[PDB]
Amino acid sequence: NSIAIPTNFTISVTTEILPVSMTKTSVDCTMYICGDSTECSNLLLQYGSFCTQLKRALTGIAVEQDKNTQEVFAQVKQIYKTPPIKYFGGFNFSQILPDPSKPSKRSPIEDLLFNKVTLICAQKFNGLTVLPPLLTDEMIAQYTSALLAGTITSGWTFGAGPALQIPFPMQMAYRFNGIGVTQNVLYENQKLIANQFNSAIGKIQDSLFSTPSALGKLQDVVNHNAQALNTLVKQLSSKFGAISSVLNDILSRLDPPEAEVQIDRLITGRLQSLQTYVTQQLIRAAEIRASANLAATKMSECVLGQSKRVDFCGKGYHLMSFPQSAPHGVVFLHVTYVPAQEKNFTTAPAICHDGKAHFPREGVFVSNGTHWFLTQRNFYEPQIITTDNTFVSGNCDVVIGIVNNTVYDPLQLELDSFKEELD
Amino acid sequence: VLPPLLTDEMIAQYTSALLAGTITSGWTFGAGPALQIPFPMQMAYRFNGIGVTQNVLYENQKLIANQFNSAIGKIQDSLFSTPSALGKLQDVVNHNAQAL
Amino acid sequence: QQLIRAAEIRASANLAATKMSECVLGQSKRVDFCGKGYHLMSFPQSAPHG
Amino acid sequence: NSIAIPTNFTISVTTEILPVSMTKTSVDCTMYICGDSTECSNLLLQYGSF
Amino acid sequence: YEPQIITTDNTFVSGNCDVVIGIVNNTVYDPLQLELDSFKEELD
Amino acid sequence: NTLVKQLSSKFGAISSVLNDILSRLDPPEAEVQIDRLITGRLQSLQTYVT
Amino acid sequence: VLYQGVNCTEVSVAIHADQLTPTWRVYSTGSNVFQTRAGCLIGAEYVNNSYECDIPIGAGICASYQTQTKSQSIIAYTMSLGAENSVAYSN
Ligand SMILES: *[C@@H]1O[C@H](CO)[C@@H](O[C@@H]2O[C@H](CO)[C@@H](O[C@@H]3O[C@H](CO)[C@@H](O)[C@H](O)[C@@H]3O)[C@H](O)[C@H]2NC(C)=O)[C@H](O)[C@H]1NC(C)=O
Ligand SMILES: *[C@@H]1O[C@H](CO)[C@@H](O[C@@H]2O[C@H](CO)[C@@H](O[C@@H]3O[C@H](CO)[C@@H](O)[C@H](O)[C@@H]3O)[C@H](O)[C@H]2NC(C)=O)[C@H](O)[C@H]1NC(C)=O
Ligand SMILES: *[C@@H]1O[C@H](CO)[C@@H](O[C@@H]2O[C@H](CO)[C@@H](O[C@@H]3O[C@H](CO)[C@@H](O)[C@H](O)[C@@H]3O)[C@H](O)[C@H]2NC(C)=O)[C@H](O)[C@H]1NC(C)=O
Ligand SMILES: *[C@@H]1O[C@H](CO)[C@@H](O[C@@H]2O[C@H](CO)[C@@H](O)[C@H](O)[C@H]2NC(C)=O)[C@H](O)[C@H]1NC(C)=O
Ligand SMILES: *[C@@H]1O[C@H](CO)[C@@H](O[C@@H]2O[C@H](CO)[C@@H](O)[C@H](O)[C@H]2NC(C)=O)[C@H](O)[C@H]1NC(C)=O
Ligand SMILES: *[C@@H]1O[C@H](CO)[C@@H](O[C@@H]2O[C@H](CO)[C@@H](O)[C@H](O)[C@H]2NC(C)=O)[C@H](O)[C@H]1NC(C)=O
Ligand SMILES: *[C@@H]1O[C@H](CO)[C@@H](O)[C@H](O)[C@H]1NC(C)=O
Ligand SMILES: *[C@@H]1O[C@H](CO)[C@@H](O)[C@H](O)[C@H]1NC(C)=O
Ligand SMILES: *[C@@H]1O[C@H](CO)[C@@H](O)[C@H](O)[C@H]1NC(C)=O
């Protein structure tokens, strides 16, 4: 017969950092294998379509990377703007909304994310090039801003039809109903909730600034791609058992037949290095695609809605989420309701009044040791047990652990204070 | 072959912690602090969650507890008598051994 | 082959973790996600490699 | 105008089995290719960072 | 949109009028008092 | 379509047809030319399966 | 034709010097040579008007085939992301 019920709460904001896309590379098979060598290219032509297959695989990956970014961020029909006056019930969004004074309209948090993660083809060039993304960082920032403006000014309505404006405190009140907490909890505590939110956002900035490992997930993608290209360039140095790693020295020192044999050995080594690179890129691309699909799912369900999936949109009961862009990825700020300061109460399945068994409609029966009250489950708020708060089914002889307590009826209580005169 | 970081005993301990939390506090522990609740009331809320009123559970609490206990016994009989039941995990082992 | 099968295992582990959070640490409204029927609750058990 | 409504219920328990992890192997590249052979190893170094 | 009269059956009461920011003044209709005042309305 | 097309490649061999290699050359040179074709076709199958 | 990863000056010099490996040449007027981050785009007229992306080029720039002041040609533009909609938010 013992239940614990929260008497307070904390608004918590957490970060979830997900890769969305990876560097889009392109490789000139012939130039990589046969660096300005006619004899090598002519030998390379005898191996078949391998260069074509490698080109197609990398093209498919590059297209996939643009698809992944578009599916994660281009989820809004219109580019939404916040009102000129950034007053949202006392909730301070200045650290998530774009700062209009900068050359790139990014939020302070976005500036941090872009600064922590790190036409001259300076890096690893041997016929190996890097293609730009279809959407620029400014365009991604515009999609993120549109999503924030939509969520802040219209809640989830912009994600399932036209955007419908709602006062922000009423949006939060509905989110509270979504997690099983009545509207009066938020309205009575609106200043506390806004202050906890603003504090949590400041903590997000300090967490990302002071903990370099938080963004490791995105940095690792960059580092892995850099290693792949670095390795691929290093593979040109290897001899693979040939007389020399330099193709021009093979042609310069040896006669055509033996030179062709040594060249064929270099062709095998370089071609296998390209096949290894492409295979690793396809596996990594599949991993990135899965991450992008998860990020798009969390964009739709966490940002353009309210989710009842446990731990999907952060730890605690989900209230709302806000996207932020990052290099090659997305960071979600998940705002959740966390119960706090629980108290021990005695409980009972039902109240026995006149022999009828009374069950709560929306709540749990609790006792402070002297009186029975009905409370909401996620926030202690004692109420008088009445016939409106409860429903009746069966009698006191069926329910195990039923307790004897008075259920008050207003109508027969007021009849008692109204018709007593009998005249 | 390198050993796992978490031993079979440590995995069992995490599983035990998860079972103790769910049984004694329902979903309150997943969302934050673990708040004790009588088990039949946790079930009453789960029934309400699926659109069945609380009185159905309380009126039929003995029947429900008996059906649960019988279902668990059936789980043991099913796993014991059907060697293929765990094939998904055995296949992983076989796939790695075959590769080596 | 190990990288491809590791990716398969990772996807399975991600599904198992999702089910752990939504089926064991909560009550799910997703049809057939946490078994057939209307979901009431779930209990994990350890198994070799899973 | 016809609707069917349950008058009773069954509590059912089902199993879901998921892989979580796979065997963590480790391979000594040099011993596998050129085991206990210096002469072979000196050629293995010429194939790059395999 | 489907407007209905605001009554004591449609709303719930918690707290006074000073704590909520942006509260407005409007009549909330109670069906039971109007009848019950009617039940002893003529006092005969 | 690509895998069948790979059968026409030489991969450094004199010809893509095993019967021409066997008919024109002596056994050990023919064996070298056949290994060149086997390596190419086997690599093509490994690519297809991957 | 998009020459990826290079400056339009380097490409223009390579055509005048006959240094490029492709043997075909794209007629240039100087009004149809536009420098993008993806590379040098020769044979398309860049316009200020933003449109929905059709044929992607890269780094925000897309191209399409449209009638220009009554005469059709390939144009390049910075893609539009969507219509702008300011929500009438108030207390
Ligand atoms: C929303 O929160 C941000 C902080 O996260 C507020 O920005 C801060 O605003 C103050 C001015 O009110 C800025 O100046 C400060 O002034 C004091 C004066 O004593 C000085 O001691 C400080 O060193 C600082 O100069 C402050 O720099 C600024 N901080 C940031 C990060 O922008 C913002 O005003 C809040 N908005 C609302 C509507 O509450
Ligand atoms: C529920 O928990 C919140 C905290 O999460 C409680 O609000 C906090 O109450 C304490 C004490 O009343 C405040 O500390 C005081 O702050 C003033 C600021 O000027 C300072 O001068 C005092 O010396 C003291 O440090 C704290 O700031 C306040 N936090 C917030 C965000 O408002 C709340 O009272 C709790 N409610 C219940 C019913 O337990
Ligand atoms: C709803 O279904 C449950 C079964 O899932 C019904 O309970 C079952 O009722 C039958 C007949 O009353 C019980 O069988 C009898 O069991 C006694 C045990 O001593 C035996 O001596 C009899 O010969 C007979 O086999 C059965 O055990 C019982 N099952 C459980 C788990 O209690 C229940 O009555 C159904 N309710 C309605 C309203 O249909
Ligand atoms: C349980 O709650 C009731 C209701 O608040 C407490 O009784 C009230 O106590 C206040 C003083 O704090 C009195 O002014 C009220 O008149 C009391 N009301 C009634 C109906 O008795 C009761 O004391 C609480 N019990 C415990 C153990 O805390
Ligand atoms: C709740 O009240 C009922 C009476 O309305 C109690 O039932 C009585 O319990 C006494 C115990 O000595 C018996 O002698 C009576 O015969 C019972 N009467 C009936 C009609 O059941 C019931 O025990 C009370 N429960 C609690 C927990 O106090
Ligand atoms: C709702 O009505 C109450 C009166 O029933 C208003 O309260 C009065 O407000 C005036 C404002 O000048 C004060 O001078 C009175 O002393 C207040 N009286 C009481 C009893 O509070 C209240 O302001 C009204 N609210 C709105 C939003 O119109
Ligand atoms: C092209 O070169 C000129 C100088 O010749 C330079 O000013 C310009 O910025 C370069 N453009 C790009 C895109 O690199
Ligand atoms: C409830 O009572 C138990 C008694 O052992 C105690 O350990 C626990 O901390 C109490 N919880 C609260 C919230 O008071
Ligand atoms: C909303 O309330 C704030 C309170 O500070 C006020 O400054 C702002 O102008 C109000 N907005 C409207 C549209 O009334």
Author numbering:
A (entry chain F): 710 to 827, 849 to 1153
B (entry chain E): 860 to 959
C (entry chain E): 1010 to 1059
D (entry chain E): 710 to 759
E (entry chain G): 1110 to 1153
F (entry chain G): 960 to 1009
G (entry chain G): 610 to 679, 689 to 709
Q: What does the literature reporting this entry say, word for word?
A:
In this study, we used single-particle cryoelectron microscopy (cryo-EM) to investigate structures of the apo KP.3.1.1 spike and its complex with hACE2. To investigate the interactions between KP.3.1.1 S and the cell receptor, we also determined a structure of KP.3.1.1 S/hACE2 complex at 2.9 Å resolution using cryo-EM. Two RBDs were found to be in the up position, with each RBD binding to an hACE2 molecule, while the third RBD is in the down position. Compared to JN.1, both KP.3 and KP.3.1.1 share two mutations, F456L and Q493E, in the receptor-binding domain (RBD) of the spike protein. KP.3.1.1 contains only one additional change compared to KP.3, a deletion in the NTD (S31Δ). Q493E alone reduced hACE2 binding, while F456L by itself had minimal impact on the binding; however, hACE2 binding with the Q493E mutation was recovered in the context of F456L (JN.1.11 + S31Δ+Q493E vs. KP.3.1.1). This phenomenon has been observed and structurally depicted in the KP.3 variant. Thus, we also observed the epistatic effect of F456L and Q493E in KP.3.1.1, which together enhanced hACE2 binding, compared to the substantially reduced binding with Q493E alone. Furthermore, a KP.3.1.1 S with hACE2 structure further confirms an epistatic effect between F456L and Q493E on hACE2 binding. In this study, we demonstrated that KP.3.1.1 retains this synergistic epistasis.
The JN.1-sublineage KP.3.1.1 recently emerged as the globally prevalent SARS-CoV-2 variant, demonstrating increased infectivity and antibody escape. We investigate how mutations and a deletion in the KP.3.1.1 spike protein (S) affect hACE2 binding and antibody escape. To investigate the effects of N30 glycosylation introduced by S31Δ and two RBD mutations (F456L and Q493E) on the structure and function of the spike protein, we determined the cryo-EM structures of the recent SARS-CoV-2 variants KP.3.1.1 and JN.1.11 along with engineered variants JN.1.11 + S31Δ+Q493E, JN.1.11.1 + S31Δ, and JN.1.11 + S31Δ. The spike proteins exhibited three conformational states: “one RBD up,” “all RBD down,” and “flexible” (i.e., one or two RBDs disordered in the density maps due to flexibility).
